[PDB]
Amino acid sequence: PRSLKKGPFVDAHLFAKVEAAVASNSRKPIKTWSRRSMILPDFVGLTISVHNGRNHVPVIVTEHMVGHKLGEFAPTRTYRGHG
Amino acid sequence: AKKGMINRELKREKTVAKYAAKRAELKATIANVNASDEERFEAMLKLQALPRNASPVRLRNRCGLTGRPHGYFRKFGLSRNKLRDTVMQGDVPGVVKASW
Amino acid sequence: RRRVVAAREILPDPKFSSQTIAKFMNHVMQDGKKSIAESIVYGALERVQEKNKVDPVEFFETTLEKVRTALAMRWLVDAAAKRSEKTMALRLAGELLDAAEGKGAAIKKREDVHRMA
Amino acid sequence: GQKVHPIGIRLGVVKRHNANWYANPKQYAEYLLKDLQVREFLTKKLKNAMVSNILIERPSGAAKVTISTARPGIVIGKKGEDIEKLQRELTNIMGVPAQVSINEIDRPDLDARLVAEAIASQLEKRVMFRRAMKRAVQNTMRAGAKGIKVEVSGRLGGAEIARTEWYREGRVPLHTLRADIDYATMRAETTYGTIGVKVWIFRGEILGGM
Amino acid sequence: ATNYGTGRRKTATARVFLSAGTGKLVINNRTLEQYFGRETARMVVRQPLELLEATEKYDLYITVKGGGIGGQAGAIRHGITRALIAADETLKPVLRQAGFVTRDAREVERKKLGLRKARKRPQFSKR
Amino acid sequence: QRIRIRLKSFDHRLIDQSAQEIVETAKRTGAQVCGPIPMPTRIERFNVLTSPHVNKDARDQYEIRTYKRLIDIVQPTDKTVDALMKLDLAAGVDVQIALG
Amino acid sequence: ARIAGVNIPDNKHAVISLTYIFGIGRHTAKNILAAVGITETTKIRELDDAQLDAIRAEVAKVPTEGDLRREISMNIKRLMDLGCYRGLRHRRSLPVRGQRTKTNARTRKGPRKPI
RNA sequence: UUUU
RNA sequence: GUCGGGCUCAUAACCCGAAG
RNA sequence: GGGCCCGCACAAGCGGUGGAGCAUGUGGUUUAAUUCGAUGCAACGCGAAGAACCUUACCUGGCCUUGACAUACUAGAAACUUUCCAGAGAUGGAUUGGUGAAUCUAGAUACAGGUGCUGCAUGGCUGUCGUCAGCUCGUGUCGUGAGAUGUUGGGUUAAGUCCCGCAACGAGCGCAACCCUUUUCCUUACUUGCCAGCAUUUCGGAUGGGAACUUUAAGGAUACUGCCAGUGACAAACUGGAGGAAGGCGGGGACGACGUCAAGUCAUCAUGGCCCUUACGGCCAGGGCUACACACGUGCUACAAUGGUCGGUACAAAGGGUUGCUACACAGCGAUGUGAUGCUAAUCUCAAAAAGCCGAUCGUAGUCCGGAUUGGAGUCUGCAACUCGACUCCAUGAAGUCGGAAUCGCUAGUAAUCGCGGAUCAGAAUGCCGCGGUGAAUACGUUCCCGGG
Ligand SMILES: [Mg+2]
Ligand SMILES: [Mg+2]
Ligand SMILES: [Mg+2]
Ligand SMILES: [Mg+2]
Ligand SMILES: [Mg+2]
Ligand SMILES: [Mg+2]
Ligand SMILES: [Mg+2]
Ligand SMILES: [Mg+2]
Ligand SMILES: [Mg+2]
Ligand SMILES: [Mg+2]
Ligand SMILES: [Mg+2]
Ligand SMILES: [Mg+2]
Ligand SMILES: [Mg+2]
Ligand SMILES: [Mg+2]
Ligand SMILES: [Mg+2]
Ligand SMILES: [Mg+2]
Ligand SMILES: [Mg+2]
Ligand SMILES: [Mg+2]
Ligand SMILES: [Mg+2]
Ligand SMILES: [Mg+2]
Ligand SMILES: [Mg+2]
Ligand SMILES: [Mg+2]
Ligand SMILES: [Mg+2]
Ligand SMILES: [Mg+2]
């Protein structure tokens, strides 16, 4: 994990988008390729569509998804079985 | 290598050399202790707001003549294929075939 | 090989000046840990010295021809371990005193060959 | 197959290096890449001449290059326009005041470079490869060599399946390290592809070591 | 009355200074038992002086460096015999018969390109 | 004062003659040479794959050695520093002249 | 001889016998025995019934068998329900820490299956 | 013991 | 009988193990 | 299709693999993609001496069109350097200084570009038989002639090595030798390395000093059946022994004949031919190369008492260090952090060698063996460790009690076992290439298996 003496890492364009949306109480999903930014306690409530390689999957931020990386909630590989 | 790869490398190291002083002084401001914490947080912000290609971690060593990304030797600046050819014909000073 | 070869000679052990003792502790050694091996055999010898007082180099070569040389020295190093007595220096110095008085572990091990002889 | 290179196997034995300079392990690469450029530029800047060897030295933050050519009159021209302009070209590459020395080759039939270059320039005019090979072998043995081998490889005579043809006259002891042996390779760019010429020339043994 | 010998074994040196006196030893400013905990290295060191039956007529001042236990013990033995035959050359036949005069030239053989360790090659398999 | 001369080179045939040409030149213009001491040699070695595509156990092993020699001149006269600085030395030898 | 609802071996040194409680390793056993004031080489057999009470007091300060088992089994449930990468790797019983699965995962996957 |  | 492993430059015979 | 001879080829021994868990490459399967190549021995820890972005060749989306790069033409502007807005970024817009060669910008035709195809069109490079012992010529002689002899036969040798018989006599390339390193000694050299004999000691070669010894590294000497005895054909060679550090090739490396396999490589590079040219070229962000019912190859760690843990105490070689290595001090359980010293190195540093020795404990238990897997809390590199890093701490504590048929490596400082270093590299080795410590067992023999002459 990232060092605690550096703080959490959030992208700058994503943080601008989130702070802009939180002031207007909008409901439109935020589309982003970030996938590596940390989920801040401010994100809780919003709907973020994160890239997964081919599509942008919608994610609803819950009070328990704080501290994870965005890409944790958008898997990349497809697998059903082998038989 | 293809001719776009060599220009990509030239592009990257040109941009690295352009942004050396600023990145270094931001790295110094961050690692300081007698500055404000807001100082050392705005320094962090301005550091990771540079272009991606300004970081020397994205530089890959290639053969000086052909441009091969594998089998590189830092002492020589060439990859193994041209190293064998220029050594075995006598153009590299000091190098001989080794026997213990 | 295909033409001919000679055999190698062994410096006799430095404490009792014997060659058979050196060859015996060369069968007990593994991984080049010769300190462990010489501790084991010297302990066995200085054990059989204080009990049933007799010269060790004599008692050893007396009990060897009871079991007979390499294949003889293998049965001793084997049947002394599968014994569950104590430290190896003590369950090796146990099979020697067993085989001297005609025991069944390594002494009467070769007797099984005498039946099928 | 897979023989060792005749020159590099005896580089501290009976052969010197073609580069003579020292550099600290962080300056070695810049020097190496700066004189590889000088070689790769001089080999074509002097293609019509008969250059056979190029020696590079760096005495006291300087640059000295000895060009051992078979016809210095062309690499110099009139006295004062080719050696004086070449030097102004070898500084833009070396970044240091360069010097150019000339070493005229007497008997230019005992160095494998010139024999190979001649055989290639003949093969690139549609001459029978056997004629050229035999002529070179015959013309070098008269100049005093104690042995010569020539090798030609690849789609000979405009054919469709490639093959190798070699020719020898004399002794060429390749396993004797005190035997000095000149060796060269060259490429012929024919209407059907590449042809490879290899030349070994033997001139006697060396007594005394280094 | 101070004679000197030098003995190599594998990578050890063993500078040995032999002189007249009672029987006392030092190895690297350390008595014989303080230096070799291996009890059979001591009886390699004490072999030449007990061969001639003397064992008590000589003082020995030894230094040694390089190598391991067995290497340094054999080096010291070699050096002691070479310091001994420097005093009285007459003893050289006897010391030759016990095999103390020969320098053991066996060294570690280098690892080779494409093998595990100098003679051991990787595991072979067909099909 | 004192002079220390350190010589570094890739060729020892050359370093020997440079050293023994400096020593006698100093001996002519005075005295007090402290000999060409040989310092231990650096040997770095490389393994180079000789095939273009795939053959791991087929490699050429190359080697380069650096030789170092040391010379001291203890009490030099007023005509030795010039007799030394007025000396041309062949290529492939690095000469470091130091006072302390 | 009976601590934290477990029967610990009696003919054993104390620092070795205290590790039979789920949740107590060797470091924690050393800490407990030092805090209470008992040497590590003392057998559980040689302990007065008035020292065992201070041992139980000190053990009660760290999580043990049932509390800890339930604590572990709740985090995995939370992960599996939230729906992150690790919860998914837990549902499918595959390595969660980045190991390879093309081969060598037989401790998470179990005995082999024919086809 | 079948095939090159 | 089948599936897997072994022997073979390949293949079968044969050998080992397993499931049923 | 027969005969002889040789090689860890078999036999004799020692230790493994096949069984377990993990690492790594491959096949298959899955996928948007899981980039491409290498397939008996001679592909499978192989190209790759090191895929988080980059690498990157692949996929999804967004973009450019004489182009990221060259040459020849025209017109305008010193290159260069600040501040900001949109955008995931590519990319567009706006601002600040600056005043004929170089140096950007705009337009335009030939062209550039292609890791696209053919290794069965090729050059160069490599594997393999195999360091196997063969491949030839000129004469002089035989067969009308193509050709043969030489080179075949008895021994011997690592060897077409040598001796001997021989219509052959000689000679060449291969074998050996010349080159590197190790073992003994000698000479020159005396610091940053050394400390025998003096003194001084704050006990530290530390300091007056000394040039002996160790070492450092350059040049020499020495081994040839030279001496003795036998065997042997007046032979070659072999067996013994005296000296000698060493004895018959003292040990190891490098060096790979003529040729075989349309062997491998158009993806290092070059190149004939074919194909694409608002795309099969070029620039980005995110994903993938790390997937997982399975099968195989190569490794690592164990199943313990010749051992595990804890306390004390010894003995190396070879390598690396200025964008680097760090004495020492403080903080922390620790990974590490802060300060601060020496070092461009025989000077300072990595750095602790580890197995070993002495003492205590565990007493044959799935254990004080074993460490997989999982939960929780951290450190560091980096713009960023979700997919997908390494390391530290606490807890958890699988399988495993020596492995079926079968199969592999090794002939001596070797096998076995124990640590140390480097190349690649910001970070990322159980791989690769090296270094020393401890240090064995066995070889009657050539019927059999495999390859070769
Ligand atoms: Mg290209
Ligand atoms: Mg990189
Ligand atoms: Mg070893
Ligand atoms: Mg060595
Ligand atoms: Mg197999
Ligand atoms: Mg427990
Ligand atoms: Mg062998
Ligand atoms: Mg066998
Ligand atoms: Mg291809
Ligand atoms: Mg391998
Ligand atoms: Mg245009
Ligand atoms: Mg081919
Ligand atoms: Mg080819
Ligand atoms: Mg011959
Ligand atoms: Mg040879
Ligand atoms: Mg083919
Ligand atoms: Mg192919
Ligand atoms: Mg092509
Ligand atoms: Mg990308
Ligand atoms: Mg892969
Ligand atoms: Mg344990
Ligand atoms: Mg079980
Ligand atoms: Mg055969
Ligand atoms: Mg033969």
Numbering used by the authors:
A (entry chain t): 2 to 84
B (entry chain o): 2 to 101
C (entry chain h): 3 to 70, 97 to 145
D (entry chain d): 2 to 211
E (entry chain j): 2 to 128
F (entry chain k): 4 to 103
G (entry chain n): 2 to 116
How does the study describe this entry?
The 30S head of the tigecycline-ribosome structure contained significantly more density outside the expected region compared with the 30S head of the amikacin-ribosome structure, suggesting that the particle subtraction and focused refinement procedures within multibody refinement were less effective. Furthermore, despite similar Fourier shell correlation-derived resolution estimates for the 30S head in the two structures, the masked and sharpened 30S head map of the tigecycline-ribosome structure was visually poorer than the corresponding map from the amikacin-ribosome complex, with protein side-chain and RNA base density less consistently resolvable across the whole map, no matter the sharpening B factor used. The reason for the larger improvement in the 30S head in the amikacin-ribosome reconstruction compared with the 30S head in the tigecycline-ribosome reconstruction is unclear. Furthermore, principal component analysis reveals that the largest variation in the data for the tigecycline-bound ribosome is due to 50S-30S intersubunit rotation, compared with a combination of 30S head rotation and intersubunit rotation for the amikacin-bound ribosome Tigecycline-induced locking of the 30S head is plausible, considering that the primary tigecycline binding site is at the interface of the 30S head and body (Jenner et al., 2013).
